[PDB]
Design a protein around this nucleic acid. Structure first.
Ligand SMILES: [Mg+2]
Ligand SMILES: [Mg+2]
Ligand SMILES: [Mg+2]
Ligand SMILES: [Mg+2]
Ligand SMILES: [Mg+2]
Ligand SMILES: [Mg+2]
Ligand SMILES: [Mg+2]
Ligand SMILES: [Mg+2]
Ligand SMILES: [Mg+2]
Lengths: 218, 129, 88
RNA sequence: GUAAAGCGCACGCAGGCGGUUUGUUAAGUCAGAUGUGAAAUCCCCGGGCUCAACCUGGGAACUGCAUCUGAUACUGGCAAGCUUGAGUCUCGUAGAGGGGGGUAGAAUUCCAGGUGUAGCGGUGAAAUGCGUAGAGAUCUGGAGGAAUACCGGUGGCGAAGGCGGCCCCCUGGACGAAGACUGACGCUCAGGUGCGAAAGCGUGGGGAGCAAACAGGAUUAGAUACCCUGGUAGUCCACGCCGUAAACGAUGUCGACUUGGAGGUUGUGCCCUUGAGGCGUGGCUUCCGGAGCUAACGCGUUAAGUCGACCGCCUGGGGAGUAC
């Protein structure tokens, strides 16, 4: 397991005949991710990544999952990276042209209450909109500054962020996901057989890829 | 029942190729072999073996290429209860040539092209594209 | 349908060796057994159609076995029929 | 599968198809040659009418049949086997499978008697009806017929239709276990033969309950109905007949492949079996669903997916499954 010997396998017995080629056993009534053959996908997943990362490539990081969120919000903050850990909308990729605009408000309204342009007019007015920003930074505050379409994307577990891969593969965006047992490794052209959660597991691989990303650009 | 042995091999092949499988098992026979040979000598299968001395099997290895299987299509032709025999100037051309037509001649069971040039016709077998 | 001794008995009487019940002879004989004997269970009841249906099986199965013999060997056939007066 | 279309289901003659090895034959098969396939059409190249239509030289072709000479993979014949198909033996397991004969209890109806006295029954209300000749209720005894609560279930069995108390007799199939044996004896099947819910028919029994018909009472504008009170065939039995049904999974039989999940029923191997229990490995069977299929709904290893042997059937709707 190289070092990732802190998650091994997961997903009781629901599994998926597709993720089959990525199991060692099923002890304790649950398949065991063959980390012995995961090592390739492990460190290598970052290989093809650093390449596009060096070109200042726009790499996204999805993961709405409650546990991942708090950790993913920092993952992409490694430098020139973007994150999306709050319910992947249905268009922030395939129909960006629209959502990309909704972001504007987020900007201004933010910089507004951010500087001096906020405590003006009536209080009720501001008070009512002093929240809108928040909700916006959740589903955009992380993928906002993104200029246009991301060079690629890296999502935690396929199943959950199903829509993420869908809208992507439609545009032709590389799929860097960590599919395990239940997960479906078909939407991900970059198979990464590994747990779909576990704080100790996610974090380990979260900042993991970031390496080749930050180490990629010169 | 197994009134048609040949068909079994053909079908067992495409079916496996679809489910993405290394090789395929099945009791071999004199003809099943010669036919399987051509499938190899022509580029459709890695290799093949015949385990069991008393009861012969057939470790027919399936071949693939990119994100798809090599055997794009294979159907039976001279099926039983409806045999098919063609002359030297009758032998068809599978997929305008990009395919193969296994034919059994009095000189052996080779491909259409080979049998055709040899100047002899024979009972067709299948049209492995 | 039949009995241990009843069966085993007719077996040896037609088996060149032992435990060779597969023998065509043993079969033809073993078949006719419940056959020429079930006649009673059918001479009466009559309405017992379900069990009747099966009666035919051991009759037909026996039929094919005989026709087979006539093809795989004339003698055995023309010699076996007599021991049971079969084929009239 | 639902659009037209799977015989209601079995057995099986003819016919069609036939697991595997060797040898042999050389019939089908293929190669060659030889006859012959009239000429004219057609076609190719080329000629001749000023071109063309038209005419014409030569060749190609005439899909074919016959004979001869080979070739032998494949189909067939034949000879010898071979065991995985099929089957026989052994031992067990499960079962509302079938025919026969008994039998048990609950209830209904009717009869007789006691106690008892003004109702009961039924409805949306009502009425018809049963009650002072004493009902109803309740108790005691008796007669008779039909059906078998609970178990009982996504359950089980059967070819289909279908099959439920218990007991016995006679009997058909299915499944596992490890072997023993026969050695392709197989798969399908026009016609044919047989089985076939219910109703219906005949003869003769039986007849409690239910109930077409029929009679009353209501309802209604009418009510040849729905509701009520009665009630005949029939329903039950034996023997014979009639062959139909949404005889439905609306999906023919047989064999081989093809990701998975959960549950039921019944069998068996191994296991601290110590133990309920763990690991398997068969038959049948529910529901969910992937690939793919599908016009969609949906089907999905019990396929409507991928294939092979055989059969049945469809060809617009109405007329008409009628007429003859
Ligand atoms: Mg209709
Ligand atoms: Mg129809
Ligand atoms: Mg049917
Ligand atoms: Mg001519
Ligand atoms: Mg031969
Ligand atoms: Mg009747
Ligand atoms: Mg009658
Ligand atoms: Mg059944
Ligand atoms: Mg389904």
């Amino acid at each position: 397991m190289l070092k990732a010997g802190v998650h091994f396998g997961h997903q009781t017995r629901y599994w998926n005949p597709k993720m089959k080629p990525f199991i060692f056993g099923a002890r304790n009534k649950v398949h065991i991710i063959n980390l012995e053959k995961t090592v390739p996908m492990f460190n290598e997943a970052l290989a093809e990544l650093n390449k596009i990362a060096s070109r200042k490539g726009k790499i996204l990081f999805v993961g709405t999952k409650r546990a991942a969120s708090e950790a993913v919000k920092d993952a992409a903050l490694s430098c020139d990276q973007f994150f999306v850990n709050h319910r992947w909308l249905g268009g922030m990729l395939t129909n960006w042209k629209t959502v990309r605009q909704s972001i504007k408000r987020l900007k201004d309204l933010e910089t507004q209450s951010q500087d001096g342009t906020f405590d003006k007019l009536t209080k009720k007015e501001a008070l009512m909109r002093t929240r809108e920003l928040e909700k916006l930074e959740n589903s955009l505050g992380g993928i906002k500054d993104m200029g246009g379409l991301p060079d690629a994307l890296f999502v935690i577990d396929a199943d959950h962020e199903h829509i993420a891969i869908k809208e992507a593969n439609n545009l032709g965006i590389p799929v860097f996901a960590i599919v395990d047992t239940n997960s479906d490794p078909d939407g991900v052209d970059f198979v990464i057989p590994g747990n779909d959660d576990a704080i100790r597991a996610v974090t380990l691989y979260l900042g993991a890829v970031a390496a080749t990303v930050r180490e990629g650009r010169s | 029942s197994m009134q048609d042995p040949i068909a079994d091999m053909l079908t067992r092949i495409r079916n496996g190729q679809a489910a993405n499988k290394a090789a395929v098992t099945m009791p071999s026979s004199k003809l099943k072999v010669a036919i399987a040979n051509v499938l190899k000598e022509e580029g459709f299968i890695e290799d093949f073996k015949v385990e069991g001395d008393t009861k012969p099997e057939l470790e027919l290895t399936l071949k693939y290429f990119q994100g798809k299987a090599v055997v794009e299509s294979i159907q039976r032709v001279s099926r039983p209860g409806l045999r098919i025999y063609k002359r030297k100037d009758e032998l068809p051309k599978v997929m305008a040539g990009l395919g193969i037509a296994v034919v059994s001649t009095s000189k052996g069971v080779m491909t259409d092209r080979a049998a055709r040039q040899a100047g002899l016709g024979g009972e067709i077998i299948c049209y492995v594209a | 349908s039949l009995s241990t001794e009843a069966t085993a008995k007719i077996v040896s009487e037609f088996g060149r060796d032992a435990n060779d019940t597969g023998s065509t002879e043993v079969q033809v004989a073993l078949l006719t057994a419940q056959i020429n004997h079930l006649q009673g269970h059918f001479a009466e009841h009559k309405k017992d159609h379900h069990s009747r249906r099966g009666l035919l099986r051991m009759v037909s199965q026996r039929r094919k076995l005989l026709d087979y013999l006539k093809r795989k060997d004339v003698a055995r056939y023309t010699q076996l029929i007599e021991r049971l007066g079969l084929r009239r």
